[PDB]
């Protein structure tokens, strides 16, 4: 409903003890699947298939991570463990402080994301697409660590 302002911060622990940082910028939108709140955290990508309730025991992640999830072309998983919605819930349940789907491959997620506005999650859910989506994955793909900063103006 409102535009989400994503700042992707790259940092380096300088030897002086201090930290230097390189901010990148993007925009996406808040899904009504989730709260209209700002958030921030160490970015973690998740494979969409990593987000199944199916697994009895999974990997642990430190609490507070900003998930990042590249959705796939609809026709490449015939039936998922869960719906996009469902998966955000997993994320949040697994300690996600927010979730950011790169929606480029599949828009319908959007209509499926905003479909559960009745029972919204504690925490923001956001999508991105297009060049804004590409930049995200360029950082997520080539860098070691990056902190995400989502603001609700």
């Amino acid at each position: 409903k409102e535009t989400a302002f994503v700042e992707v911060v790259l940092f380096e622990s300088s030897p002086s003890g201090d930290y230097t940082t390189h901010t990148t910028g993007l925009t996406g939108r808040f899904s009504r699947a989730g709260a209209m709140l700002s958030a921030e955290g160490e970015i973690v990508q998740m494979h969409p298939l990593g987000l199944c309730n199916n697994n009895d025991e999974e990997d642990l992640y430190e609490y507070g991570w900003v998930g990042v999830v590249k959705l796939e072309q609809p026709e490449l998983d015939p039936k998922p463990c869960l719906t996009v919605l469902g998966k955000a819930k997993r994320a949040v349940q697994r300690g996600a402080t927010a979730v950011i789907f790169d929606v480029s491959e599949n828009p319908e997620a959007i209509d499926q994301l905003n479909q559960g506005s009745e029972d919204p999650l504690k925490r923001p859910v956001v999508y991105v697409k297009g060049a804004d989506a590409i930049k995200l994955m360029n950082i997520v793909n080539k860098q070691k660590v990056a902190r995400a900063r989502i603001q609700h103006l």
């Binding site: 298939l49 990593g50 199916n54 990997d59 590249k70 796939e72 997520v140 793909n141 990056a146």
Partner: protein, 105 residues
């Protein structure tokens, strides 16, 4: 050449594995991708799941291979196998085989 997958990509690696192959989430730092595996790496085993054939953790501490979550079949390098579990030093009344890394009487 993402290998062993029906579906695939630069951003998620492999996906929805081919045939009977086993799906395995690898992780390096933030990044995470799919792999459509033949014989899962240390700590994991081919498990036949609801979603798909996927690779799972071998419960037993220090273990390299299982046939099931809770029984180790090949212990890891350094360690001795005994009754499912994995040991650094074989338990009281038991003696080592450095050859088989097994454990005896």
């Amino acid at each position: 050449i993402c290998k062993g997958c029906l579906s695939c990509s630069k951003d998620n690696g492999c996906s929805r594995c081919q045939q009977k192959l086993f799906f395995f989430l690898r992780r390096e730092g933030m990044r995470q991708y799919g792999e459509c595996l033949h014989s899962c790496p240390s700590g994991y085993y081919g498990h036949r799941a609801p979603d798909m054939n996927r690779c799972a953790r071998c419960r037993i501490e220090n273990c390299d291979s299982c046939f099931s979550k809770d029984f180790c079949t090949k212990c890891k390098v350094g360690f001795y196998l005994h009754r499912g579990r994995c040991f650094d030093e074989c338990p009281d009344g038991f003696a080592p085989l450095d050859e088989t890394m097994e454990c005896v009487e």
